[PDB]
Amino acid sequence: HHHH
Amino acid sequence: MMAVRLTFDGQKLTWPGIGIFKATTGLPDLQWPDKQCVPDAAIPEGNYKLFIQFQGEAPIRNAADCDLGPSWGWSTIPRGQAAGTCEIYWANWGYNRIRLESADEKTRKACGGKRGGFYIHDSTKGYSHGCIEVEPVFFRILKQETEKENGEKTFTVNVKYVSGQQTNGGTKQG
């Protein structure tokens, strides 16, 4: 799960 | 040593018996309880465990793309070495982060289980990429309260939105  | 059950209502993160901290969840247009199944929106309601054990610097997964690896603890963001685009991206992390994990099946199955990777972090942007941005003083209270205790240290947070209000607690830098 990425955040950018 | 007593367990701590933090609460988060979209604008305030409460440490019962200690204090209330400004907090925010979601990207600017997604700070709403009816968007909690959209990626990077307000975090889904339910019960989460915090990993507060301090583990030092967060791992760097890809330095070129500014990618941080996951870690199950309280870690720091390597702002001092950021250059170019990473000065932008890592300012959205801040300086400290604490991993969260869904702590029951109802929370974990939310939104078809498509969302994840949640943290509490101390950027000062007024938004958060699918995590909880908190007032930085929270981490200093956390340090002071835990470093003098010898026994077990168990922290959770319950997320529950009780109105349609925007999930923005005023964390943007004044």
Side-chain angles (χ1 to χ4, degrees):
Chain A
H1 295 274
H2 289 310
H3 309 92
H4 70 301
Chain B
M1 332 302 178
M2 289 297 300
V4 176
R5 175 177 181 276
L6 303 177
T7 62
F8 176 51
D9 71 2
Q11 295 190 348
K12 304 170 182 60
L13 179 73
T14 297
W15 181 332
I18 296 238
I20 300 167
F21 306 87
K22 296 187 289 182
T24 298
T25 184
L27 295 175
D29 274 347
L30 301 173
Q31 292 169 0
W32 302 106
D34 63 13
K35 299 285 173 162
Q36 60 185 273
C37 284
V38 178
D40 291 324
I43 185 178
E45 290 171 283
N47 293 301
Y48 300 88
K49 168 176 175 182
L50 279 74
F51 296 72
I52 63 157
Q53 290 181 342
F54 187 66
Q55 295 179 349
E57 180 177 328
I60 304 169
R61 185 181 54 207
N62 177 349
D65 299 358
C66 312
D67 286 1
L68 295 181
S71 65
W72 286 264
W74 172 3
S75 56
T76 61
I77 310 300
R79 299 289 293 280
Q81 61 190 84
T85 55
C86 304
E87 282 179 30
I88 298 292
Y89 290 118
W90 293 350
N92 294 325
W93 278 108
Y95 287 89
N96 294 267
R97 77 184 181 166
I98 288 162
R99 181 67 184 215
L100 298 173
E101 281 295 338
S102 54
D104 57 41
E105 197 64 9
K106 188 168 118 73
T107 306
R108 176 161 44 261
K109 278 207 206 297
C111 304
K114 299 299 179 191
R115 299 202 54 203
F118 309 117
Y119 297 76
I120 295 171
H121 61 115
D122 68 351
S123 44
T124 58
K125 285 298 194 181
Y127 59 73
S128 170
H129 285 73
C131 300
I132 304 174
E133 180 180 79
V134 71
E135 211 179 343
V137 69
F138 169 80
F139 283 86
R140 303 202 303 279
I141 295 294
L142 181 65
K143 186 176 188 297
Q144 176 165 341
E145 294 293 320
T146 55
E147 64 180 350
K148 271 189 165 62
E149 295 285 356
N150 62 35
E152 212 178 27
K153 303 168 186 65
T154 307
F155 282 72
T156 60
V157 54
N158 178 263
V159 179
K160 181 180 288 101
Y161 311 116
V162 293
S163 67
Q165 287 186 3
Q166 192 180 15
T167 59
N168 189 309
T171 48
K172 177 175 164 67
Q173 190 91 295

Short mmCIF file of all heavy atoms in Angstrom, two decimals, chain A, chain B residues 61 65 67 117:
data_model
loop_
_atom_site.label_atom_id
_atom_site.label_comp_id
_atom_site.label_asym_id
_atom_site.label_seq_id
_atom_site.Cartn_x
_atom_site.Cartn_y
_atom_site.Cartn_z
N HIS A 1 0.85 -1.20 0.00
CA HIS A 1 0.00 0.00 0.00
C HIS A 1 0.88 1.25 0.00
O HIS A 1 1.64 1.49 0.95
CB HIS A 1 -0.95 0.04 1.20
CG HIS A 1 -1.96 -1.06 1.21
ND1 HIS A 1 -3.17 -0.97 0.56
CD2 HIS A 1 -1.94 -2.28 1.80
CE1 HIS A 1 -3.84 -2.09 0.73
NE2 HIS A 1 -3.12 -2.90 1.49
N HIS A 2 0.79 2.02 -1.07
CA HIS A 2 1.63 3.19 -1.24
C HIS A 2 0.94 4.43 -0.66
O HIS A 2 -0.26 4.44 -0.35
CB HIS A 2 1.95 3.42 -2.71
CG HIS A 2 2.91 2.41 -3.28
ND1 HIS A 2 4.10 2.10 -2.66
CD2 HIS A 2 2.85 1.66 -4.40
CE1 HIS A 2 4.74 1.20 -3.38
NE2 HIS A 2 4.01 0.91 -4.44
N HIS A 3 1.73 5.50 -0.52
CA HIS A 3 1.22 6.79 -0.07
C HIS A 3 1.65 7.93 -0.97
O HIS A 3 1.62 9.09 -0.56
CB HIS A 3 1.65 7.03 1.37
CG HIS A 3 1.35 5.88 2.28
ND1 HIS A 3 2.25 4.86 2.52
CD2 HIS A 3 0.23 5.55 2.98
CE1 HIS A 3 1.71 3.97 3.33
NE2 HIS A 3 0.48 4.37 3.63
N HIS A 4 2.07 7.61 -2.19
CA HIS A 4 2.30 8.59 -3.25
C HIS A 4 2.47 7.88 -4.59
O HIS A 4 2.24 6.67 -4.68
CB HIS A 4 3.52 9.46 -2.94
CG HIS A 4 4.82 8.73 -3.03
ND1 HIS A 4 5.11 7.63 -2.25
CD2 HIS A 4 5.92 8.95 -3.79
CE1 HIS A 4 6.33 7.20 -2.53
NE2 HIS A 4 6.84 7.98 -3.47
N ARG B 61 13.04 2.09 0.67
CA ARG B 61 12.82 1.02 -0.30
C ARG B 61 13.40 1.35 -1.67
O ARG B 61 14.12 0.54 -2.25
CB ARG B 61 11.32 0.74 -0.42
CG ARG B 61 10.94 -0.43 -1.31
CD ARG B 61 9.41 -0.58 -1.36
NE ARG B 61 8.76 0.66 -1.76
CZ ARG B 61 7.52 1.02 -1.42
NH1 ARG B 61 6.76 0.25 -0.66
NH2 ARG B 61 7.05 2.19 -1.84
N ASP B 65 12.65 6.98 -6.32
CA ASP B 65 11.24 7.32 -6.32
C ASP B 65 10.76 7.82 -4.97
O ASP B 65 9.57 8.13 -4.84
CB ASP B 65 10.40 6.12 -6.75
CG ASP B 65 10.73 5.65 -8.17
OD1 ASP B 65 11.59 6.28 -8.82
OD2 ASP B 65 10.13 4.66 -8.62
N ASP B 67 10.65 6.16 -2.04
CA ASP B 67 9.76 5.13 -1.51
C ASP B 67 10.29 4.63 -0.17
O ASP B 67 11.43 4.17 -0.08
CB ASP B 67 9.66 3.96 -2.49
CG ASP B 67 8.80 4.28 -3.70
OD1 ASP B 67 8.30 5.43 -3.78
OD2 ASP B 67 8.60 3.38 -4.55
N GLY B 117 -2.14 -0.17 4.97
CA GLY B 117 -0.97 0.65 5.13
C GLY B 117 -1.15 1.87 6.01
O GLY B 117 -0.60 2.93 5.68
#
